[PDB]
Structure formats: structure tokens, C-alpha cells
A paper describes a structure:
As a potential broadly reactive immunotherapy against NW pathogenic mammarenaviruses, we designed a TfR1 mimetic that blocks the GP1 receptor-binding sites. Thus, we based our apical-domain design on wwTfR1 instead of on hTfR1 to achieve high-affinity targeting of pathogenic arenaviruses.
To verify the binding mode of sAD to GP1, we crystallized and solved the structure of GP1MACV in complex with sAD to 2.7 Å resolution. The designed sAD forms a complex with GP1MACV in a similar fashion to hTfR128, while maintaining the overall structure of the hTfR1-apical domain. Most of the important interactions that GP1MACV makes with hTfR1 are also formed with sAD, including the key interaction with Tyr211. We did observe some structural differences; however, the long loop that connects parallel strands βII-6 and βII-7 of sAD, which was mutated and shortened, changed its conformation compared with hTfR1. In the case of hTfR128, Glu294 from this loop forms a salt bridge with Lys169 of GP1MACV, and in the case of sAD an alternative salt bridge with Lys169 is formed with Glu340 from αII-2 instead. We thus introduced an S206A mutation to the sAD portion of Arenacept (referred to as Arenacept-M1) to eliminate the N-X-T/S glycosylation motif.
Residue numbers in the entry:
A (entry chain B): 87 to 241
B (entry chain A): 195 to 209, 211 to 297, 330 to 378
């Protein structure tokens, strides 16, 4: 089937695809750099971002649901599988400089996927959308019962 | 047996994992410190003296180089820092040994990768006098905090 989406509150959103669950956050912090981390130029490259390769399909769909153009848009960054921190996919959606237009599109994507989406990005500052697969050390305990319990899943 | 970690937190928007550093560590105990991150150049006595911004209750990030790391952490603790992050600069500076006396706060060595990932979330350029990379920055502002966990 198609993944199901629910937002806990303005901070934490969640996707459920197959057996896997991915945390989605929007904030002004980046822990990835072009110089050190993996750039996703084409959908195949997503098979470098997740602990198991197959689950990357869930990311693929989500990308296209946001409006990401795999042809013209900036590559998203992700942490390599070999690294032991976890899995972290960044979309640079800053309301500034060269990502402004792109960012808008992604936020519009969110508005269609999460009814009641809250835009935390402040104008002129840096802003990011981050995806962490649940269970990896990078999602911490944000995929536990105290969070996913009081979120109800749909679609 | 939980790995040592450096993470960044915003104002309650979440915790983001920067690095699991395999580098050398000193434990006073298995500790978890959280606070503002602040640059102190080489961590010498004069470096801390010349800072224009508060060090107390803050984690200091310093470069390896002019003095021994024990002196760096002794100075940081002398100015009431709660933890020390040490990263290695691109130019290696020889250590010289002056008069020194006889580790309570956590001390974690991080890759220059993690240092730059922290800096990109920090503000204010480092003085040109330091002769260090342009990625260097001084203060973690915007109510952000760094969380160092040493097990
Ligand atoms: C996610 O996306 C955002 C937005 O695109 C990025 O943030 C910008 O990153 C770019 C590229 O590094 C920065 O562009 C540079 O801007 C400088 C002006 O400084 C302004 O912004 C800084 C913020 O640090 C303020 O401190 C300062 O007061 C200014 O307001 C310029 O000096 C640079 O010029 C360079 O390019 C010209 C050609 O255009 C060269 O000829 C010059 O010699 C010079 O080298 C450059 O344009 C920009 O500052 C960033 N903006 C903000 C708001 O941070 C993020 O970096 C990106 N994140 C990731 C992880 O990729
Ligand atoms: C979001 O929910 C978590 C717990 O699920 C809570 O601790 C946090 O304060 C909430 N934040 C906002 C902005 O609603
Ligand atoms: C991931 O890391 C391994 C070894 O560290 C490297 O060979 C591989 O090319 C990396 N992946 C990418 C997409 O660069
Ligand atoms: C540093 O000391 C001053 C004393 O005036 C105090 O107000 C401040 O809160 C201290 N900083 C921290 C981070 O504890």
C-alpha cells in the first residue's frame, strides 16, 4: 500500500511505510555537510541512506509527495549507511538565498500531506526538513510509545 | 557501553545527533552535560582571559596545539566550564611546556568533521589572528545547546 502519515504536534511528524516508521522534523539545525555526507542526485542513491535498502522506497514516494524534482532541484543530503550515528536525510528548505523558491515548494508539499502543518521556518534564516528512520540512534526515543501512542495514523 | 555522543538541541524542537566519537575520552564518571557551546581557541590561560563572552556553565571547544590537553581542561575548569571538546586543526602546532601544577569535567576529542558540523550551527567569525579555518565560529546562540554524553 501507500504510507500513512500523522503529525504529533508542531515539532514531530511521522510516516509509516510497510514495516518501517520514519520521524520527520522541521527546524533550523543541520548536522550534515556537502563535503562529508552523501548527496542524492537520483532516487537510486537513496539506497545509501537507510539501514536496509528496500525501505528506501518509502523515502522515494515521500520525496515526490513533497514536490522534489529529481532533475532540477538541489540534491538532498543523507548520512552514509556505514556511519554508526543512524540515518539522517536533509532537505534544505531555508527561506533565504538560493533555496527560497525550492523551500516554498517543499513546505507546500507538507501542507498537502499533513493537515494542520506548522511552518517553523523564519524568514532570512536557515531551515531544514530532516528524516530519521525509527530505531536508528539518530531518531533517539522519539519513536517510542509516549509519542506514537497519542498519534493516530491515516492514509 | 552506550557510545559517547555529541548532539545539538534547539529550544525543545528536538535533539539532533552530531557524532559518535571513537576518539580518546577521560571519564571522571559516566556523565551527561548540556549547555551553550563556546570556542576558546587553544584553551590557554590568555585565550580564556581574552574571550569577550561568558564561559561559566558552558561547554568549551578548543584546538589541540600550544599546550597539553590536561592544561586545557584545567584552564576550562578554572573558568567554571562544564565540559571540553577538542578537535584537531589543519595546521599542527607544537606543544611547549611551561610551569604547570597537577579531570572532573568530561573531555571528548571530536573529528574536524564534527567540529565543522557544530560550527555551521554557531555564529560569529573567529578572529583572523587565530589563523584557523573560515568554518571556525565562536558562539552557539539562538537558545541552542550541545549535549555531550560520556559513558
Ligand atoms: C541551506 O540553504 C541556505 C540558503 O541557501 C544556506 O545558507 C546560505 O549559504 C550560502 C552559501 O554558503 C551563504 O551565501 C554567502 O552569503 C554571504 C553573505 O553573508 C550573509 O549571510 C551571513 C550568514 O552566515 C551573515 O552573517 C551575513 O551578515 C550576510 O547577511 C556572501 O558573503 C557569500 O558571497 C560569496 O559568493 C560570491 C558569489 O555570489 C563570491 O564571489 C564571493 O567572493 C563570496 O565568496 C555567499 O553568497 C549565505 O550566507 C547563507 N545564508 C544564511 C541565511 O545562512 C545554507 O548554508 C544551506 N545549508 C547547507 C547545509 O547547505
Ligand atoms: C510536542 O510533544 C512532546 C511530547 O510528545 C512534548 O514534550 C513537547 O513539549 C511538544 N511540543 C510542542 C511544541 O507541542
Ligand atoms: C559509505 O562508506 C563506505 C566506506 O566508509 C564507502 O566505501 C562508500 O562509498 C560510502 N558511500 C557513499 C555513497 O559514498
Ligand atoms: C555566569 O555567572 C553569572 C554571574 O553574574 C550568572 O548570572 C550566569 O547565569 C552564569 N552563567 C551560567 C551559564 O550559569
Amino acid at each position: 500500500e501507500l504510507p500513512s502519515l500523522c503529525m504529533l504536534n508542531n515539532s514531530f511528524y511521522y510516516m509509516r511505510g510497510g514495516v518501517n516508521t520514519f520521524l520527520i522534523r522541521v527546524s533550523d539545525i543541520s548536522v550534515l555537510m556537502k563535503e562529508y555526507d552523501v548527496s542524492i542526485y537520483e532516487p537510486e542513491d537513496l539506497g545509501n541512506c537507510l539501514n536496509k535498502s528496500d525501505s528506501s522506497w518509502a523515502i522515494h514516494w515521500f520525496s515526490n509527495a513533497l514536490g522534489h524534482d529529481w532533475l532540477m532541484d538541489p540534491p538532498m543530503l543523507c548520512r552514509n549507511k556505514t556511519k554508526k550515528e543512524g540515518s539522517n536525510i536533509q532537505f534544505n528548505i531555508s527561506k533565504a538565498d538560493d533555496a527560497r523558491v525550492y523551500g516554498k515548494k517543499i513546505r507546500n508539499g507538507m501542507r498537502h500531506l499533513f493537515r494542520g502543518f506548522h511552518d517553523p521556518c523564519e524568514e532570512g534564516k536557515v531551515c531544514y526538513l530532516t528524516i530519521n528512520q525509527c530505531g536508528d540512534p539518530s531518531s533517539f526515543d522519539y519513536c517510542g510509545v509516549n509519542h506514537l501512542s497519542k498519534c493516530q495514523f491515516d492514509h | 557501553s552506550a557510545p559517547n555522543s555529541v548532539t545539538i538541541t534547539n529550544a525543545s524542537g528536538g535533539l539532533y545527533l552530531v557524532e559518535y566519537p571513537e576518539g580518546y575520552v577521560a571519564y571522571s564518571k559516566a556523565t551527561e552535560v548540556t549547555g551553550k557551546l563556546v570556542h576558546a581557541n587553544f584553551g590557554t590561560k590568555k585565550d580564556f582571559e581574552d574571550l569577550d563572552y561568558a564561559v561559566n556553565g558552558s561547554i568549551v571547544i578548543v584546538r589541540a596545539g600550544k599546550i597539553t590537553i590536561a592544561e586545557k581542561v584545567a584552564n576550562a575548569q578554572s573558568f567554571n566550564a562544564i565540559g571540553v571538546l577538542i578537535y584537531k586543526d589543519r595546521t599542527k602546532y607544537p606543544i611547549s611546556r611551561a610551569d604547570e601544577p597537577l579531570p572532573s569535567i568530561p573531555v571528548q576529542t571530536i573529528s574536524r568533521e564534527a567540529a565543522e558540523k557544530l560550527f555551521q550551527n554557531m555564529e560569529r567569525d573567529c578572529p583572523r589572528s587565530w589563523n584557523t579555518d573560515s568554518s571556525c565560529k565562536l558562539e552557539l546562540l539562538q537558545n541552542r545547546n550541545v549535549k555531550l554524553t560520556v559513558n
